[PDB]
Amino acid sequence: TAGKQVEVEKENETIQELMIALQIHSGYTNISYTI
Amino acid sequence: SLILDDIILSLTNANERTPPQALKTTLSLLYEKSKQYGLSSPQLQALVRLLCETSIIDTVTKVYIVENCFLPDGYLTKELLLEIINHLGTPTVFSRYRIQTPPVLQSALCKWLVHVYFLFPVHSEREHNISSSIWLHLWQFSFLQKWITPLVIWQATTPVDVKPWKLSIIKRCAMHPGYRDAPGSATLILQRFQCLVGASSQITESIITINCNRKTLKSHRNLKLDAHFLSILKRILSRA
Amino acid sequence: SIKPLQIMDLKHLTRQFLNENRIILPKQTWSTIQEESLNIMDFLKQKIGTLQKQELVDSFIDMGIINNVDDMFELAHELLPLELQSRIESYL
Amino acid sequence: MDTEALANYLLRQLSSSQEYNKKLLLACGFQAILRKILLDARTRATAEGLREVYPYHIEAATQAFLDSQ
Amino acid sequence: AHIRTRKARNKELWDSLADFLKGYLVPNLDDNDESIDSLTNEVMLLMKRLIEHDLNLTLNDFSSKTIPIYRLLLRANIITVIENPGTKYIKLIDFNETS
């Protein structure tokens, strides 16, 4: 289904927002912009 | 100019054991030529990281260097905000071995970023999404709120930026005891979301749940911005 | 001497807690909590004036506030700002 | 007033890193008792079927606290 | 034609998350006396549990080895913890919703 490409786009979004929060609140010091 | 690198590269080698009058020379030499040629963005990156990792400069003189010599000669680099970002926060159970940087120095770095907001570089939109959430997360550090909230606000441009999960983060923090100013800073961010996406029931009723005297909000909306610093900066940016 | 603690300060330390439940305090109840904020502070000022490392929260379990130290962190999370939370975490 | 503010308030009427943290722990203890008391109060104000916590509920609950605990 | 760059991006986030766990987050746990891959899998499982919004995930799913993780999510304010049993379920806040 071409609507389940709208689902990987949504887990694409949460992994991204998840890492930012792990990195910041675990004192990571190599925070960048990953593709 | 090239002089501002033997300067900067020297401070890098300084430590305990250096003739402290040798130091004060190099600092004054820094205060001097920074006001003249201004600071080249890669130099500025090397400066800010020594400012956040070395012990051999009084912290209140660190603040002074940010308040009187952080004068960029153009647009800021993205690798520069990452260098600042990677030095903000609190020591955590995964990060106890970390060199952590005095909070006052931290917030002063932020206040400085507010002054040079117009020099921020262009972000790809994926990059803008990231940057928008970092500052919101950072916003929660009680001692960065005063100066983060302008950055989280000014980055709020399209109604894509304002989403529900950012709202509770904000609402949690406003209502949260153990924060003093957060209701002021929070309503602000909210009003900018209101002023941006339009109606949205969630936002408008959040603002109600946070009652602010209508006069802390007027002490929060107006910032003093140190005109002397932007004076010197306009001069630098004019020249080359 | 500022022994009676400000009403507006109470109405802030707790306004989230009240909203998060059912609690509707008129201004009259607010005064009542103020004078009681004294005898409740009165209580533990003689409870243990000894400031101990280990039994500090062990004292707190005895009071029926918590069951363990995990509960104390859940309290830190809801009463302290972010950066103190990371601190207290290592203290436990 | 915030929670750290409440910490120094408490200790000033009575009295280095490890002792700072306990001061904070103590400030959470005050609000923990205090909200136990307001929650006790709400239940006996809802026992009687009322909209609203009335003052007696408060001094009931506060002594209902210091007696048992 | 625009679909296999996002599925491309999707693996490059999964292994980025993985590489960050194996690389930084789990080593700074340093529990299980030295079981960095025995623990990474514990933790990796937990994150895909969170990311896929497994509703069966509860506080008891955290070993006393991995409980800081839980505390880290708690601090970051990016999970909701809710209890008929006296047990407590954990889900990620919603990052995709737009209303």
Author numbering:
A (entry chain H): 147 to 181
B (entry chain I): 2 to 241
C (entry chain T): 269 to 360
D (entry chain W): 1 to 15, 36 to 89
E (entry chain K): 136 to 218, 222 to 237
According to the publication:
Kinetochores are large multi-subunit complexes that attach centromeric chromatin to microtubules of the mitotic spindle, enabling sister chromatid segregation in mitosis. CCAN is a conserved 14–16 subunit complex composed of discrete modules. Cenp-TW interacts directly with Cenp-HIKM to form a six-subunit complex (Cenp-HIKM-TW) in vertebrates, and a five-subunit complex (Cenp-HIK-TW) in budding yeast.
Cenp-HIKHead is assembled from the N-terminus of Cenp-IHead (residues 1–241) and the C-termini of Cenp-H (residues 147–181, Cenp-HHead) and Cenp-K (residues 136–237, Cenp-KHead). Although we crystallized a complex of Cenp-HIKHead-Cenp-TW using the full-length Cenp-T subunit, in our structure the N-terminal 268 residues are disordered, consistent with disorder predictions, with only the HFD and HFE being visible. The crystal structure of the Cenp-HIKHead-TW sub-module reveals that the major contacts between Cenp-HIKHead and Cenp-TW involve Cenp-IHead and Cenp-KHead of Cenp-HIK and Cenp-T of Cenp-TW, with Cenp-HHead and Cenp-W making minor contributions. In interface 1, the C-terminal anti-parallel α-helices (H4 and H5) of the HFE of Cenp-T combine with H3 of Cenp-K to create a compact three helix bundle. Interface 1 is dominated by a network of electrostatic interactions involving Arg206 and Arg210 of Cenp-K and Asp338, Glu357 and Ser354 of Cenp-T. In interface 2, the conserved L5 loop (residues 177–182) of Cenp-IHead inserts into a cavity within the Cenp-TW dimer formed by the interface of H1 of the Cenp-T HFD, turn connecting H4-H5 of the Cenp-T HFE, and N-terminus of Cenp-W. His177Cenp-I in the L5 loop, a highly conserved residue, makes an important contribution by providing a C-terminal helix cap to H4 of Cenp-T. We fitted the Cenp-HIKHead-TW sub-module to the previously determined cryo-EM map of the S. cerevisiae CCAN–Cenp-ANuc complex. This showed that the HEAT repeat domain of Cenp-IHead and C-terminal HFD of Cenp-T of the Cenp-HIKHead-TW sub-module interact with the nucleosome DNA gyre at a site close to the Cenp-ANuc dyad axis.
